[PDB]
């Protein structure tokens, strides 16, 4: 009978998270609940990682000359308009964690899943994962450099 590409269960992926990456995911989830959104999204995670200057996501934006305020406003205006019970992760966020773990465990040479790999996978498939506002903000970030020099570019990170 017909099968699709293998999917890893969410709790196995969450267990790969670096301890600080995981703490920020827990913050993203609380944020979602506080806002009464229906799904935890990559935007909620970004929103919280932006508050730590040594997150991988901050370190990438600093290197790209991007301002925290512009990314915050793009996120504020694309949050779900629905108000809701515990949310689920969005199916796009589950699938994103699985691609970012596959990249981490292979090309990035990372023992743990970090927000930098999650961000790199979303940027590498930005048509799939990024809203039009984020695409346009992040258009100039060099994915190949970030992939090839991941560990050095993000050497200052709290997620190491």
């Amino acid at each position: 009978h017909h099968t699709d590409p293998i999917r890893i269960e969410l709790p196995t992926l969450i267990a790969k998270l670096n301890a600080q990456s995981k703490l920020a995911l827990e913050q993203a989830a609380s944020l979602c609940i506080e806002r009464q959104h229906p799904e935890v999204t990559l935007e909620h995670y970004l929103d919280v990682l932006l508050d730590n200057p040594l997150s991988d996501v901050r370190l990438v934006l600093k290197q790209a000359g991007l301002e925290v305020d512009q990314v915050k406003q793009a996120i504020a205006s694309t949050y779900s308009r629905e108000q809701v019970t515990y949310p689920a992760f969005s199916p796009l966020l589950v699938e994103l964690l699985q691609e970012a773990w596959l990249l981490s465990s292979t090309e990035l040479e990372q023992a743990e899943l970090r927000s930098g790999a999650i961000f790199l996978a979303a940027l590498t498939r930005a048509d799939r994962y990024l809203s039009f506002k984020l695409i346009s903000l992040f258009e100039g970030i060099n994915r190949e450099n970030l992939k090839k020099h991941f560990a050095m570019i993000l050497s200052d990170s709290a997620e190491t």
Binding site: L10, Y86, A88
Partner: peptide, 14 residues
């Protein structure tokens, strides 16, 4: 007992 992320993960399966 179940954490926030535990509850959210269960909802994700369901």
């Amino acid at each position: 007992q179940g954490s926030l992320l535990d509850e959210i993960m269960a909802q994700t399966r369901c």
